[PDB]
Amino acid sequence: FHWEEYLKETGSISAPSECFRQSQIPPVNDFKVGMKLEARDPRNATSVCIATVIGITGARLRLRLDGSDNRNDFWRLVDSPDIQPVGTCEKEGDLLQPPLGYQSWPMFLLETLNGSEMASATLFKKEPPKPPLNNFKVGMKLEAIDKKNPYLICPATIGDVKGDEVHITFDGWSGAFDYWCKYDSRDIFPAGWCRLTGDVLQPPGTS
């Protein structure tokens, strides 16, 4: 896939990077499979749990909460506020929580981290600020995560704009998995993001 040729083919423009809540220069990802960190449970934002890096993909981490099975992994950018180095939870005066389905508690936390490599505090990058305005316009193209298959990023188009929300429509598909999101969502990126970060943009659908 090549954006320049695609934009020519579809007679469209890509949304300028200034529209997204993503750093102009993508954050580098130096995490390694197996590293330990702390992550807010995707089910409960008020709960922080010990997590392990299951995989690396572009500027993102495939994560799993220690103590749970491998069916609910989630993906987070290295500059996501949902992740932090081990010890942050306690430093902020809170207590680590068990993940859903978990099966003493203090000892588990000890054993699950013992001898493990903790992701360095420097690997967690600064969260990009929210753009002051929603400058997305109907017709602009971008790269968006398929929320039903998060490991995939696909070419999309802004189908509509209302207030602080934008309608993400996936090119080539029949709206099967399109979705609305805030303009400052961390799940959308400017054209060329996958190429810069070493990920792969899925080809558009065939319809």
JSON list of C-alpha atoms in Angstrom, two decimals:
[
{"chain": "A", "resi": 1, "resn": "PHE", "atom": "CA", "xyz": [0.00, 0.00, 0.00]},
{"chain": "A", "resi": 2, "resn": "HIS", "atom": "CA", "xyz": [1.22, 3.49, -0.89]},
{"chain": "A", "resi": 3, "resn": "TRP", "atom": "CA", "xyz": [-0.67, 6.63, 0.17]},
{"chain": "A", "resi": 4, "resn": "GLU", "atom": "CA", "xyz": [0.50, 8.90, -2.65]},
{"chain": "A", "resi": 5, "resn": "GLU", "atom": "CA", "xyz": [-0.77, 6.50, -5.29]},
{"chain": "A", "resi": 6, "resn": "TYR", "atom": "CA", "xyz": [-3.94, 5.77, -3.30]},
{"chain": "A", "resi": 7, "resn": "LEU", "atom": "CA", "xyz": [-4.86, 9.44, -2.83]},
{"chain": "A", "resi": 8, "resn": "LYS", "atom": "CA", "xyz": [-4.36, 9.93, -6.57]},
{"chain": "A", "resi": 9, "resn": "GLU", "atom": "CA", "xyz": [-6.54, 6.91, -7.32]},
{"chain": "A", "resi": 10, "resn": "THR", "atom": "CA", "xyz": [-9.34, 8.02, -4.98]},
{"chain": "A", "resi": 11, "resn": "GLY", "atom": "CA", "xyz": [-8.95, 11.71, -5.83]},
{"chain": "A", "resi": 12, "resn": "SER", "atom": "CA", "xyz": [-8.75, 12.50, -2.13]},
{"chain": "A", "resi": 13, "resn": "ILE", "atom": "CA", "xyz": [-6.56, 14.23, 0.42]},
{"chain": "A", "resi": 14, "resn": "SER", "atom": "CA", "xyz": [-5.31, 12.88, 3.74]},
{"chain": "A", "resi": 15, "resn": "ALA", "atom": "CA", "xyz": [-6.13, 14.67, 6.98]},
{"chain": "A", "resi": 16, "resn": "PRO", "atom": "CA", "xyz": [-3.17, 16.83, 8.07]},
{"chain": "A", "resi": 17, "resn": "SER", "atom": "CA", "xyz": [-1.24, 15.48, 11.06]},
{"chain": "A", "resi": 18, "resn": "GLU", "atom": "CA", "xyz": [-2.29, 18.57, 13.05]},
{"chain": "A", "resi": 19, "resn": "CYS", "atom": "CA", "xyz": [-5.81, 17.09, 13.24]},
{"chain": "A", "resi": 20, "resn": "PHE", "atom": "CA", "xyz": [-4.76, 14.13, 15.38]},
{"chain": "A", "resi": 21, "resn": "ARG", "atom": "CA", "xyz": [-3.91, 13.65, 19.02]},
{"chain": "A", "resi": 22, "resn": "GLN", "atom": "CA", "xyz": [-0.64, 11.97, 17.99]},
{"chain": "A", "resi": 23, "resn": "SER", "atom": "CA", "xyz": [2.88, 13.42, 18.12]},
{"chain": "A", "resi": 24, "resn": "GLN", "atom": "CA", "xyz": [4.11, 14.84, 14.80]},
{"chain": "A", "resi": 25, "resn": "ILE", "atom": "CA", "xyz": [7.14, 12.60, 15.26]},
{"chain": "A", "resi": 26, "resn": "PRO", "atom": "CA", "xyz": [5.83, 9.15, 16.27]},
{"chain": "A", "resi": 27, "resn": "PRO", "atom": "CA", "xyz": [7.11, 7.91, 19.64]},
{"chain": "A", "resi": 28, "resn": "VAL", "atom": "CA", "xyz": [9.89, 5.34, 19.44]},
{"chain": "A", "resi": 29, "resn": "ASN", "atom": "CA", "xyz": [9.00, 1.91, 20.86]},
{"chain": "A", "resi": 30, "resn": "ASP", "atom": "CA", "xyz": [11.88, 0.29, 22.73]},
{"chain": "A", "resi": 31, "resn": "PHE", "atom": "CA", "xyz": [9.80, -2.16, 24.75]},
{"chain": "A", "resi": 32, "resn": "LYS", "atom": "CA", "xyz": [10.66, -5.86, 24.51]},
{"chain": "A", "resi": 33, "resn": "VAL", "atom": "CA", "xyz": [8.43, -8.92, 24.74]},
{"chain": "A", "resi": 34, "resn": "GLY", "atom": "CA", "xyz": [8.32, -10.07, 28.36]},
{"chain": "A", "resi": 35, "resn": "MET", "atom": "CA", "xyz": [8.80, -6.70, 30.05]},
{"chain": "A", "resi": 36, "resn": "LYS", "atom": "CA", "xyz": [6.66, -5.85, 33.07]},
{"chain": "A", "resi": 37, "resn": "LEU", "atom": "CA", "xyz": [4.74, -2.61, 33.55]},
{"chain": "A", "resi": 38, "resn": "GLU", "atom": "CA", "xyz": [1.50, -1.29, 35.00]},
{"chain": "A", "resi": 39, "resn": "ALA", "atom": "CA", "xyz": [-1.65, -0.81, 32.94]},
{"chain": "A", "resi": 40, "resn": "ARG", "atom": "CA", "xyz": [-5.17, 0.41, 33.59]},
{"chain": "A", "resi": 41, "resn": "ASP", "atom": "CA", "xyz": [-7.62, -2.45, 33.12]},
{"chain": "A", "resi": 42, "resn": "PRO", "atom": "CA", "xyz": [-9.46, -1.90, 29.79]},
{"chain": "A", "resi": 43, "resn": "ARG", "atom": "CA", "xyz": [-12.64, -2.82, 31.67]},
{"chain": "A", "resi": 44, "resn": "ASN", "atom": "CA", "xyz": [-12.06, -0.56, 34.67]},
{"chain": "A", "resi": 45, "resn": "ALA", "atom": "CA", "xyz": [-10.18, 2.72, 34.24]},
{"chain": "A", "resi": 46, "resn": "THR", "atom": "CA", "xyz": [-9.94, 3.10, 38.02]},
{"chain": "A", "resi": 47, "resn": "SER", "atom": "CA", "xyz": [-7.96, -0.14, 38.37]},
{"chain": "A", "resi": 48, "resn": "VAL", "atom": "CA", "xyz": [-4.25, -0.50, 37.66]},
{"chain": "A", "resi": 49, "resn": "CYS", "atom": "CA", "xyz": [-2.81, -3.99, 37.23]},
{"chain": "A", "resi": 50, "resn": "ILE", "atom": "CA", "xyz": [0.60, -5.52, 36.57]},
{"chain": "A", "resi": 51, "resn": "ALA", "atom": "CA", "xyz": [0.89, -6.18, 32.84]},
{"chain": "A", "resi": 52, "resn": "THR", "atom": "CA", "xyz": [3.32, -7.98, 30.53]},
{"chain": "A", "resi": 53, "resn": "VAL", "atom": "CA", "xyz": [4.34, -7.08, 26.98]},
{"chain": "A", "resi": 54, "resn": "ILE", "atom": "CA", "xyz": [3.09, -9.92, 24.76]},
{"chain": "A", "resi": 55, "resn": "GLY", "atom": "CA", "xyz": [4.10, -8.34, 21.48]},
{"chain": "A", "resi": 56, "resn": "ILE", "atom": "CA", "xyz": [5.40, -5.25, 19.73]},
{"chain": "A", "resi": 57, "resn": "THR", "atom": "CA", "xyz": [3.69, -3.70, 16.71]},
{"chain": "A", "resi": 58, "resn": "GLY", "atom": "CA", "xyz": [4.75, -0.29, 15.47]},
{"chain": "A", "resi": 59, "resn": "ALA", "atom": "CA", "xyz": [4.37, 2.29, 18.23]},
{"chain": "A", "resi": 60, "resn": "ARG", "atom": "CA", "xyz": [2.09, -0.08, 20.13]},
{"chain": "A", "resi": 61, "resn": "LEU", "atom": "CA", "xyz": [2.27, -2.84, 22.71]},
{"chain": "A", "resi": 62, "resn": "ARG", "atom": "CA", "xyz": [0.09, -5.93, 22.85]},
{"chain": "A", "resi": 63, "resn": "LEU", "atom": "CA", "xyz": [-0.54, -6.25, 26.60]},
{"chain": "A", "resi": 64, "resn": "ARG", "atom": "CA", "xyz": [-1.88, -8.87, 29.01]},
{"chain": "A", "resi": 65, "resn": "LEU", "atom": "CA", "xyz": [-2.74, -8.45, 32.68]},
{"chain": "A", "resi": 66, "resn": "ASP", "atom": "CA", "xyz": [-0.76, -10.87, 34.85]},
{"chain": "A", "resi": 67, "resn": "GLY", "atom": "CA", "xyz": [-2.97, -13.52, 36.41]},
{"chain": "A", "resi": 68, "resn": "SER", "atom": "CA", "xyz": [-5.47, -13.64, 33.54]},
{"chain": "A", "resi": 69, "resn": "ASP", "atom": "CA", "xyz": [-5.67, -15.90, 30.48]},
{"chain": "A", "resi": 70, "resn": "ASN", "atom": "CA", "xyz": [-4.64, -14.96, 26.94]},
{"chain": "A", "resi": 71, "resn": "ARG", "atom": "CA", "xyz": [-8.11, -14.10, 25.59]},
{"chain": "A", "resi": 72, "resn": "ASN", "atom": "CA", "xyz": [-8.34, -10.41, 26.46]},
{"chain": "A", "resi": 73, "resn": "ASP", "atom": "CA", "xyz": [-5.08, -8.81, 25.38]},
{"chain": "A", "resi": 74, "resn": "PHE", "atom": "CA", "xyz": [-5.27, -5.15, 24.44]},
{"chain": "A", "resi": 75, "resn": "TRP", "atom": "CA", "xyz": [-3.13, -2.73, 22.44]},
{"chain": "A", "resi": 76, "resn": "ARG", "atom": "CA", "xyz": [-1.71, 0.55, 23.75]},
{"chain": "A", "resi": 77, "resn": "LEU", "atom": "CA", "xyz": [0.58, 3.21, 22.28]},
{"chain": "A", "resi": 78, "resn": "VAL", "atom": "CA", "xyz": [3.86, 3.78, 24.12]},
{"chain": "A", "resi": 79, "resn": "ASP", "atom": "CA", "xyz": [2.67, 7.32, 24.86]},
{"chain": "A", "resi": 80, "resn": "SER", "atom": "CA", "xyz": [-0.71, 6.20, 26.19]},
{"chain": "A", "resi": 81, "resn": "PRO", "atom": "CA", "xyz": [-1.69, 7.46, 29.65]},
{"chain": "A", "resi": 82, "resn": "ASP", "atom": "CA", "xyz": [-3.02, 3.95, 30.33]},
{"chain": "A", "resi": 83, "resn": "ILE", "atom": "CA", "xyz": [0.45, 2.49, 30.89]},
{"chain": "A", "resi": 84, "resn": "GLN", "atom": "CA", "xyz": [3.17, 3.32, 33.42]},
{"chain": "A", "resi": 85, "resn": "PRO", "atom": "CA", "xyz": [6.36, 1.81, 34.89]},
{"chain": "A", "resi": 86, "resn": "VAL", "atom": "CA", "xyz": [6.09, -0.66, 37.77]},
{"chain": "A", "resi": 87, "resn": "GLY", "atom": "CA", "xyz": [5.89, 1.18, 41.08]},
{"chain": "A", "resi": 88, "resn": "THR", "atom": "CA", "xyz": [3.88, 4.11, 39.76]},
{"chain": "A", "resi": 89, "resn": "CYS", "atom": "CA", "xyz": [0.64, 2.86, 41.33]},
{"chain": "A", "resi": 90, "resn": "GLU", "atom": "CA", "xyz": [2.19, 2.65, 44.80]},
{"chain": "A", "resi": 91, "resn": "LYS", "atom": "CA", "xyz": [4.05, 5.92, 44.28]},
{"chain": "A", "resi": 92, "resn": "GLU", "atom": "CA", "xyz": [0.69, 7.60, 43.68]},
{"chain": "A", "resi": 93, "resn": "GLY", "atom": "CA", "xyz": [-0.73, 6.11, 46.86]},
{"chain": "A", "resi": 94, "resn": "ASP", "atom": "CA", "xyz": [-2.87, 3.39, 45.29]},
{"chain": "A", "resi": 95, "resn": "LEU", "atom": "CA", "xyz": [-3.03, -0.40, 45.34]},
{"chain": "A", "resi": 96, "resn": "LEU", "atom": "CA", "xyz": [-2.60, -2.76, 42.40]},
{"chain": "A", "resi": 97, "resn": "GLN", "atom": "CA", "xyz": [-5.78, -4.66, 41.54]},
{"chain": "A", "resi": 98, "resn": "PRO", "atom": "CA", "xyz": [-6.32, -8.21, 40.27]},
{"chain": "A", "resi": 99, "resn": "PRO", "atom": "CA", "xyz": [-7.55, -8.60, 36.66]},
{"chain": "A", "resi": 100, "resn": "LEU", "atom": "CA", "xyz": [-10.98, -9.99, 35.79]},
{"chain": "A", "resi": 101, "resn": "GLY", "atom": "CA", "xyz": [-11.02, -13.77, 36.09]},
{"chain": "A", "resi": 102, "resn": "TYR", "atom": "CA", "xyz": [-7.98, -13.84, 38.37]},
{"chain": "A", "resi": 103, "resn": "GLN", "atom": "CA", "xyz": [-7.49, -17.13, 40.21]},
{"chain": "A", "resi": 104, "resn": "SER", "atom": "CA", "xyz": [-1.95, -14.45, 49.06]},
{"chain": "A", "resi": 105, "resn": "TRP", "atom": "CA", "xyz": [-2.51, -11.48, 46.77]},
{"chain": "A", "resi": 106, "resn": "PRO", "atom": "CA", "xyz": [0.67, -9.69, 47.96]},
{"chain": "A", "resi": 107, "resn": "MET", "atom": "CA", "xyz": [2.73, -12.82, 47.25]},
{"chain": "A", "resi": 108, "resn": "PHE", "atom": "CA", "xyz": [1.37, -13.17, 43.70]},
{"chain": "A", "resi": 109, "resn": "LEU", "atom": "CA", "xyz": [2.54, -9.64, 42.94]},
{"chain": "A", "resi": 110, "resn": "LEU", "atom": "CA", "xyz": [5.94, -10.60, 44.35]},
{"chain": "A", "resi": 111, "resn": "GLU", "atom": "CA", "xyz": [6.26, -13.87, 42.42]},
{"chain": "A", "resi": 112, "resn": "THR", "atom": "CA", "xyz": [4.91, -12.56, 39.10]},
{"chain": "A", "resi": 113, "resn": "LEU", "atom": "CA", "xyz": [7.57, -9.81, 39.05]},
{"chain": "A", "resi": 114, "resn": "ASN", "atom": "CA", "xyz": [10.49, -11.67, 40.63]},
{"chain": "A", "resi": 115, "resn": "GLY", "atom": "CA", "xyz": [13.47, -11.91, 38.29]},
{"chain": "A", "resi": 116, "resn": "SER", "atom": "CA", "xyz": [11.55, -10.16, 35.50]},
{"chain": "A", "resi": 117, "resn": "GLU", "atom": "CA", "xyz": [12.78, -7.23, 33.43]},
{"chain": "A", "resi": 118, "resn": "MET", "atom": "CA", "xyz": [10.88, -4.04, 34.28]},
{"chain": "A", "resi": 119, "resn": "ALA", "atom": "CA", "xyz": [10.33, -1.63, 31.39]},
{"chain": "A", "resi": 120, "resn": "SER", "atom": "CA", "xyz": [12.48, 1.45, 32.08]},
{"chain": "A", "resi": 121, "resn": "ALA", "atom": "CA", "xyz": [10.67, 4.67, 32.99]},
{"chain": "A", "resi": 122, "resn": "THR", "atom": "CA", "xyz": [12.23, 6.29, 29.90]},
{"chain": "A", "resi": 123, "resn": "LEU", "atom": "CA", "xyz": [10.30, 3.95, 27.56]},
{"chain": "A", "resi": 124, "resn": "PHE", "atom": "CA", "xyz": [7.01, 5.63, 28.47]},
{"chain": "A", "resi": 125, "resn": "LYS", "atom": "CA", "xyz": [6.67, 8.62, 26.17]},
{"chain": "A", "resi": 126, "resn": "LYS", "atom": "CA", "xyz": [4.92, 11.95, 26.74]},
{"chain": "A", "resi": 127, "resn": "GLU", "atom": "CA", "xyz": [1.21, 11.90, 25.95]},
{"chain": "A", "resi": 128, "resn": "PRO", "atom": "CA", "xyz": [0.48, 14.15, 22.96]},
{"chain": "A", "resi": 129, "resn": "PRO", "atom": "CA", "xyz": [-1.77, 17.12, 23.78]},
{"chain": "A", "resi": 130, "resn": "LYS", "atom": "CA", "xyz": [-5.31, 17.34, 22.41]},
{"chain": "A", "resi": 131, "resn": "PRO", "atom": "CA", "xyz": [-5.56, 19.55, 19.33]},
{"chain": "A", "resi": 132, "resn": "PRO", "atom": "CA", "xyz": [-7.34, 22.81, 20.31]},
{"chain": "A", "resi": 133, "resn": "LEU", "atom": "CA", "xyz": [-9.90, 22.34, 17.53]},
{"chain": "A", "resi": 134, "resn": "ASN", "atom": "CA", "xyz": [-11.56, 19.52, 15.60]},
{"chain": "A", "resi": 135, "resn": "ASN", "atom": "CA", "xyz": [-10.25, 20.26, 12.11]},
{"chain": "A", "resi": 136, "resn": "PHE", "atom": "CA", "xyz": [-11.28, 16.99, 10.46]},
{"chain": "A", "resi": 137, "resn": "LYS", "atom": "CA", "xyz": [-13.41, 17.50, 7.34]},
{"chain": "A", "resi": 138, "resn": "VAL", "atom": "CA", "xyz": [-15.65, 15.10, 5.42]},
{"chain": "A", "resi": 139, "resn": "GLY", "atom": "CA", "xyz": [-13.68, 13.30, 2.73]},
{"chain": "A", "resi": 140, "resn": "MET", "atom": "CA", "xyz": [-10.27, 13.38, 4.43]},
{"chain": "A", "resi": 141, "resn": "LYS", "atom": "CA", "xyz": [-8.47, 10.04, 4.66]},
{"chain": "A", "resi": 142, "resn": "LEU", "atom": "CA", "xyz": [-6.48, 8.57, 7.55]},
{"chain": "A", "resi": 143, "resn": "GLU", "atom": "CA", "xyz": [-5.31, 5.33, 9.18]},
{"chain": "A", "resi": 144, "resn": "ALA", "atom": "CA", "xyz": [-7.60, 3.83, 11.81]},
{"chain": "A", "resi": 145, "resn": "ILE", "atom": "CA", "xyz": [-7.45, 0.83, 14.12]},
{"chain": "A", "resi": 146, "resn": "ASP", "atom": "CA", "xyz": [-10.10, -1.80, 13.43]},
{"chain": "A", "resi": 147, "resn": "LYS", "atom": "CA", "xyz": [-11.58, -1.98, 16.93]},
{"chain": "A", "resi": 148, "resn": "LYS", "atom": "CA", "xyz": [-12.87, -5.50, 16.29]},
{"chain": "A", "resi": 149, "resn": "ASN", "atom": "CA", "xyz": [-9.37, -6.66, 15.27]},
{"chain": "A", "resi": 150, "resn": "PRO", "atom": "CA", "xyz": [-7.08, -4.10, 17.05]},
{"chain": "A", "resi": 151, "resn": "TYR", "atom": "CA", "xyz": [-3.88, -5.59, 15.65]},
{"chain": "A", "resi": 152, "resn": "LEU", "atom": "CA", "xyz": [-4.97, -4.19, 12.28]},
{"chain": "A", "resi": 153, "resn": "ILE", "atom": "CA", "xyz": [-4.76, -0.57, 11.12]},
{"chain": "A", "resi": 154, "resn": "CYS", "atom": "CA", "xyz": [-6.72, 0.27, 7.96]},
{"chain": "A", "resi": 155, "resn": "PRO", "atom": "CA", "xyz": [-7.24, 3.12, 5.48]},
{"chain": "A", "resi": 156, "resn": "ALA", "atom": "CA", "xyz": [-10.32, 5.13, 6.42]},
{"chain": "A", "resi": 157, "resn": "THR", "atom": "CA", "xyz": [-12.26, 8.25, 5.53]},
{"chain": "A", "resi": 158, "resn": "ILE", "atom": "CA", "xyz": [-14.01, 10.88, 7.67]},
{"chain": "A", "resi": 159, "resn": "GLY", "atom": "CA", "xyz": [-17.62, 10.24, 6.67]},
{"chain": "A", "resi": 160, "resn": "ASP", "atom": "CA", "xyz": [-19.18, 12.90, 8.88]},
{"chain": "A", "resi": 161, "resn": "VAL", "atom": "CA", "xyz": [-18.27, 15.38, 11.61]},
{"chain": "A", "resi": 162, "resn": "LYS", "atom": "CA", "xyz": [-20.45, 16.41, 14.55]},
{"chain": "A", "resi": 163, "resn": "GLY", "atom": "CA", "xyz": [-19.16, 18.43, 17.48]},
{"chain": "A", "resi": 164, "resn": "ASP", "atom": "CA", "xyz": [-16.05, 16.79, 18.92]},
{"chain": "A", "resi": 165, "resn": "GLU", "atom": "CA", "xyz": [-16.78, 13.50, 17.14]},
{"chain": "A", "resi": 166, "resn": "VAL", "atom": "CA", "xyz": [-15.89, 12.10, 13.73]},
{"chain": "A", "resi": 167, "resn": "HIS", "atom": "CA", "xyz": [-17.34, 9.15, 11.84]},
{"chain": "A", "resi": 168, "resn": "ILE", "atom": "CA", "xyz": [-14.62, 6.71, 10.84]},
{"chain": "A", "resi": 169, "resn": "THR", "atom": "CA", "xyz": [-15.58, 4.79, 7.69]},
{"chain": "A", "resi": 170, "resn": "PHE", "atom": "CA", "xyz": [-13.33, 1.99, 6.45]},
{"chain": "A", "resi": 171, "resn": "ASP", "atom": "CA", "xyz": [-12.45, 2.12, 2.76]},
{"chain": "A", "resi": 172, "resn": "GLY", "atom": "CA", "xyz": [-13.58, -0.82, 0.65]},
{"chain": "A", "resi": 173, "resn": "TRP", "atom": "CA", "xyz": [-15.94, -2.26, 3.27]},
{"chain": "A", "resi": 174, "resn": "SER", "atom": "CA", "xyz": [-19.72, -1.93, 3.58]},
{"chain": "A", "resi": 175, "resn": "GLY", "atom": "CA", "xyz": [-19.65, -0.08, 6.89]},
{"chain": "A", "resi": 176, "resn": "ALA", "atom": "CA", "xyz": [-19.51, -3.46, 8.62]},
{"chain": "A", "resi": 177, "resn": "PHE", "atom": "CA", "xyz": [-17.14, -2.12, 11.27]},
{"chain": "A", "resi": 178, "resn": "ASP", "atom": "CA", "xyz": [-17.25, 1.67, 10.93]},
{"chain": "A", "resi": 179, "resn": "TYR", "atom": "CA", "xyz": [-17.47, 3.72, 14.11]},
{"chain": "A", "resi": 180, "resn": "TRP", "atom": "CA", "xyz": [-17.80, 7.17, 15.64]},
{"chain": "A", "resi": 181, "resn": "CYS", "atom": "CA", "xyz": [-15.08, 8.45, 17.95]},
{"chain": "A", "resi": 182, "resn": "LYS", "atom": "CA", "xyz": [-13.79, 11.66, 19.51]},
{"chain": "A", "resi": 183, "resn": "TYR", "atom": "CA", "xyz": [-11.57, 13.64, 17.15]},
{"chain": "A", "resi": 184, "resn": "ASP", "atom": "CA", "xyz": [-8.75, 13.32, 19.69]},
{"chain": "A", "resi": 185, "resn": "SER", "atom": "CA", "xyz": [-9.06, 9.53, 19.92]},
{"chain": "A", "resi": 186, "resn": "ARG", "atom": "CA", "xyz": [-5.72, 7.75, 20.23]},
{"chain": "A", "resi": 187, "resn": "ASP", "atom": "CA", "xyz": [-7.01, 5.06, 17.84]},
{"chain": "A", "resi": 188, "resn": "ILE", "atom": "CA", "xyz": [-6.70, 7.11, 14.66]},
{"chain": "A", "resi": 189, "resn": "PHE", "atom": "CA", "xyz": [-3.51, 8.31, 12.94]},
{"chain": "A", "resi": 190, "resn": "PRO", "atom": "CA", "xyz": [-2.39, 10.46, 10.00]},
{"chain": "A", "resi": 191, "resn": "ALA", "atom": "CA", "xyz": [-1.60, 8.87, 6.64]},
{"chain": "A", "resi": 192, "resn": "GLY", "atom": "CA", "xyz": [1.90, 7.41, 6.72]},
{"chain": "A", "resi": 193, "resn": "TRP", "atom": "CA", "xyz": [1.92, 6.52, 10.42]},
{"chain": "A", "resi": 194, "resn": "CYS", "atom": "CA", "xyz": [2.25, 2.78, 9.83]},
{"chain": "A", "resi": 195, "resn": "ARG", "atom": "CA", "xyz": [5.14, 3.31, 7.42]},
{"chain": "A", "resi": 196, "resn": "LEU", "atom": "CA", "xyz": [7.02, 5.54, 9.87]},
{"chain": "A", "resi": 197, "resn": "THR", "atom": "CA", "xyz": [6.52, 3.19, 12.82]},
{"chain": "A", "resi": 198, "resn": "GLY", "atom": "CA", "xyz": [7.21, -0.10, 11.08]},
{"chain": "A", "resi": 199, "resn": "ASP", "atom": "CA", "xyz": [3.65, -1.42, 11.09]},
{"chain": "A", "resi": 200, "resn": "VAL", "atom": "CA", "xyz": [1.66, -2.37, 8.00]},
{"chain": "A", "resi": 201, "resn": "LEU", "atom": "CA", "xyz": [-1.48, -0.68, 6.73]},
{"chain": "A", "resi": 202, "resn": "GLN", "atom": "CA", "xyz": [-4.12, -3.16, 5.58]},
{"chain": "A", "resi": 203, "resn": "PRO", "atom": "CA", "xyz": [-5.24, -2.88, 1.96]},
{"chain": "A", "resi": 204, "resn": "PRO", "atom": "CA", "xyz": [-8.72, -1.39, 1.58]},
{"chain": "A", "resi": 205, "resn": "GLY", "atom": "CA", "xyz": [-11.75, -3.66, 1.26]},
{"chain": "A", "resi": 206, "resn": "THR", "atom": "CA", "xyz": [-12.91, -4.85, -2.17]},
{"chain": "A", "resi": 207, "resn": "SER", "atom": "CA", "xyz": [-16.42, -3.38, -2.27]}
]
